[PDB]
Amino acid sequence: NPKAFPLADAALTQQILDVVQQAANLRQLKKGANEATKTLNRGISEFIIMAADCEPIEILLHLPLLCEDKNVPYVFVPSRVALGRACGVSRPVIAASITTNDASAIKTQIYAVKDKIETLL
Template structure:
């Protein structure tokens, strides 16, 4: 997948290193049952105020199907980030299908909290 194929609307886009960190965290979140997959589920977690972080895939076709999420994230003050590949996001979510959006959810006493906070601050740096 070339950079040329990436939709300019997919902003902020994580670079390779950050993508790896994000996908690792998604994988852990899936193990800890702190993950919701799909644009609809991600929307629900935002509306319910239980989302820590939204991960979107830049190669969703058409990308408009998930562009309501960044607006909602900004509304709810939840960081969001794009990764290049829905296939990779799907794999990290532990499913064989491509996943265009995922939400890492809030959980009391979660062991992932430090990683989530660390990632949030990295994503906030992208937006500056």
């Protein structure tokens, strides 16, 4: 019913924020709604992380539409201030994406979350 849907629980958010931090170090993370828009167009994204408390919320509701059209799992995290900290940037982040790389050192962890996020949907 709420526009932000599905909203991950505390356990799921912890695991997601763990992966995004690792993806940041390995240069597999695109930060910002505009970036998340682009990566969907090129079809190089595994899933899109979004902040449910974004101010206002709708401003990232175009990302779900692109994702569902392209069959990309997506999830909402409660906090944007938390998401930005995980990404490693010194500002809040409302949306983020994981870039596709089957030759990345964190492939298993990404797919582990990619499994659970799919179950959430």
